[PDB]
Design a protein around this ligand. Structure first.
Ligand SMILES: Nc1ncnc2c1ncn2[C@H]1C[C@H](O)[C@@H](COP(=O)(O)OP(=O)(O)OP(=O)(O)O)O1
Ligand SMILES: [Ca+2]
Ligand SMILES: [Ca+2]
Ligand SMILES: [Ca+2]
Length: 438
DNA sequence: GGGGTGTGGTAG
DNA sequence: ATCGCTACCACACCCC
């Protein structure tokens, strides 16, 4: 039990937080891409022709947590039991669940107590603990396999368990689906072997957006090849609106309110007009969804193909702690800001950078919300407040940054006992080169 | 056109 | 108990 006023809190929270791990793993994968390719341009151009293989472990955490589960939990079958990965017993997030559990309607992000109610009396919910180190070792095997194949002009990391692999098809060369299905089946089999029993699915197409939908269609433990030329009403009628990239819960609600609750991408595409779409969800997102409904990528999503090094370059750096924040006085808040600043500066120094703009953001208990929320140590219902500050010259100096961060906190007027969450952000970073003279 | 701010949204 | 992170894109409204 490490409390937020304990010097070890940040270490212990990050050690347990799957969302921290996902974000740290992604950041390390992007920096490794930059280093591996530091002397390899490997350029893709608008005139070039390519195929995308979008590869993703099926229920990654649940599959690995099961394969490596301790003897305390020997009594469960992956193919017949509803398995979830989570920390606790009641208001604890399901990090991952297996397709059996999903068959009952259970979803990642659900609380355990909610997913228990969805099980007909008789079947038992099996909760496995996280196995963070093994998640990363299986991932290592995965990215190693992908590299060893020497069949992709570009291997873009998406997350610990997900990558977008680009193969250039030269104008002279003739591609067949015979070749694609075999590349698909090789990848799936090598990864199954290299990871001791983990399965991936694969979407294969000639746009990023379609490969993504093809991969959704292929799950679980399969692969799907759907090119622009293969599009059909049958295909579109198989997807929900929030299967589209960029359509999260708020965009879904606006789409359902605007276009009379479509229930498939076929409904949406038979009903929309571009302008009504941009009116409902925004101009750029509107155009993106419009092009997506043709199977086509937008300008922003193509940039990762044309200049992946610019895209994967880190432009800001931050920490967010919105769980376990219970402080009594301004002294302990200041100490915590200081610990956060030191952590962020250690990271900033590891990447040889300075920052010229910082932000403090906080979560303050809603005036009518309970002091202790439903979730143990949760932030509960909160109001967000944020303030930023431009520095004089770029810096990595703790005295400048931590003092300004503590000043920013004071300007937001949040009593320490009402504090439920803090983010510390370095919004602009500057390169440190060999010449640091004035 | 540029830059400025604080907020909202998405994603594994 | 329980570990509700974090990068980056977009927008609204603001300065001349
Ligand atoms: N909040 C979260 N959002 C997404 N993934 C999360 C989250 N918390 C934990 N995870 C885990 C679930 C996975 O094991 C891993 C990668 O996420 P993701 O690929 O979306 O899910 P998944 O592999 O369990 O299911 P799917 O087969 O649908 O991809 O991260
Ligand atoms: Ca996955
Ligand atoms: Ca994934
Ligand atoms: Ca989506």
């Amino acid at each position: 039990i490490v409390a937020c006023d304990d010097p070890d809190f940040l270490t212990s929270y990050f050690a347990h937080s799957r969302l921290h791990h996902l974000s740290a793993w992604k950041a390390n994968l992007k920096d490794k891409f930059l280093n591996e390719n530091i002397h390899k341009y490997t350029k893709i151009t608008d005139k070039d022709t390519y195929i995308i293989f979008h590869i993703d472990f099926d229920c990654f955490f649940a599959t690995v947590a099961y394969l490596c589960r301790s003897s305390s939990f020997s009594a469960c079958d992956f193919k017949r039991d509803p398995i979830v990965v989570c920390h606790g017993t009641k208001n604890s997030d399901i990090a991952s669940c297996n397709y059996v559990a999903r068959s009952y309607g259970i979803k990642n992000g659900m609380w355990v107590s909610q997913a228990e109610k969805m099980l007909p009396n008789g079947i038992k919910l099996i909760s496995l603990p996280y196995t963070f180190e093994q998640f990363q070792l299986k991932s290592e095997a995965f990215y190693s396999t992908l590299k060893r194949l020497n069949i992709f002009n570009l291997i873009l990391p998406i997350s610990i368990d997900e990558a977008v692999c680009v193969r250039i098809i030269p104008d002279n060369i003739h591609n067949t689906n015979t070749l694609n299905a075999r590349l698909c089946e090789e990848i799936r089999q090598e990864i199954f072997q290299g990871t001791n029993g983990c399965t991936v699915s694969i979407g294969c197409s000639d746009s990023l957006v379609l490969a993504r939908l093809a991969l959704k269609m292929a799950k679980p433990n399969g692969y799907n090849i759907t090119f622009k030329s293969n599009l059909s009403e049958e295909f579109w009628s198989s997807f929900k609106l929030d299967d589209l990239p960029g359509v999260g819960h708020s965009t879904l609600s606006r789409l359902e309110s605007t276009f009379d609750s479509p229930h498939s991408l076929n409904d949406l595409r038979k009903r929309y007009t571009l302008d009504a779409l941009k009116a409902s969800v925004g101009s750029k997102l509107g155009m993106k969804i419009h092009l997506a409904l043709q199977g086509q990528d937008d300008e922003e999503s193509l940039k990762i193909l044309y200049d992946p090094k610019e895209v994967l370059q880190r432009k800001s750096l931050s920490i967010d702690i919105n769980w376990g924040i219970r402080f009594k006085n301004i002294t302990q808040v200041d100490l915590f800001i200081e610990r956060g600043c030191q952590y962020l500066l250690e990271k900033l120094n590891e990447i040889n950078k300075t920052t010229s703009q910082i932000t403090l953001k906080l979560m303050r208990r809603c005036k009518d919300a309970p002091i202790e929320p439903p979730k143990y140590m949760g932030m509960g219902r909160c109001d967000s407040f944020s303030r930023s500050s431009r520095l004089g010259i770029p810096t990595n100096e703790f005295g400048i940054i931590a003092t300004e961060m503590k000043s920013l906190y004071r300007t937001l007027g949040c009593p320490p006992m009402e504090l439920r969450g803090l983010a510390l952000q370095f919004n602009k970073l500057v390169d440190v080169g060999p010449d640091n003279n004035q």
